[PDB]
Design a protein around this ligand. Structure first.
Ligand SMILES: O=C(NCc1c(F)cccc1Cl)[C@H](OCc1ccccc1)[C@H](O)[C@@H](O)[C@@H](OCc1ccccc1)C(=O)N[C@H]1c2ccccc2C[C@H]1O
Lengths: 99, 99
């Protein structure tokens, strides 16, 4: 699909059998979701945004469906203001910027 | 052009006779640039992202040339770690997300 940017590029994602809304964010290197429970062990990671840094939990090889497209990759969990789908997963679904 | 997301989507912009590198950020509602001098009146504003909020100066009706395309819109100036081209201007150059 082709998504314009007159409004936030929010899409529905499915993770852990649950539907959530997330933002397709080309400015985010990684994918970070709001506090939730995921399987396996996690590793620590620090990500920096416009307001500073936050500590998140990194989970690898997580299944996530974005707009019906299945992806399997790294997902960060932490105190993010909104669910963010970053470049690591945008590339998996073949997302590009066009103009 | 068609921009892939393997790397950060950085482009060159021209604002106030100055060339700067900026990130095409679909996750950003507005455009925010590092501290610089811009003509005209401005209003204080607080924007929140990953890490918290930062105070910026809001300038309106600013002209910017993005990768060769002219665009007019609001530009926020403040302590951002990187120059960000947000949706307010991305829409003006006809930028869309595709997959
Ligand atoms: O910060 C953002 N938007 C804030 C904002 C606003 F609310 C109004 C006007 C302008 C802006 Cl930038 C955007 O985030 C979505 C969001 C929407 C609404 C509220 C909070 C977050 C912005 O795109 C955000 O995702 C992005 O900010 C720009 C940037 C880019 C590179 C380095 C520093 C700052 C960002 O923080 N990216 C980092 C990130 C995110 C997740 C995982 C890893 C990493 C590493 C970096 O790449």
């Amino acid at each position: 699909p082709q998504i314009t940017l007159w409004q936030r590029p929010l899409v529905t994602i499915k993770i852990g059998g649950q539907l959530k809304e997330a933002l397709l964010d080309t400015g985010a290197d990684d994918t970070v979701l709001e506090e939730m429970s995921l399987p396996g062990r996690w590793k620590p990671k620090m990500i920096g945004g416009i307001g500073g840094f936050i500590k998140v939990r990194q989970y690898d090889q997580i299944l996530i469906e974005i707009c019906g497209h299945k992806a399997i990759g790294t997902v960060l969990v932490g105190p993010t203001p909104v669910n963010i789908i970053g470049r690591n997963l945008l590339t998996q679904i073949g997302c590009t910027l066009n103009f």
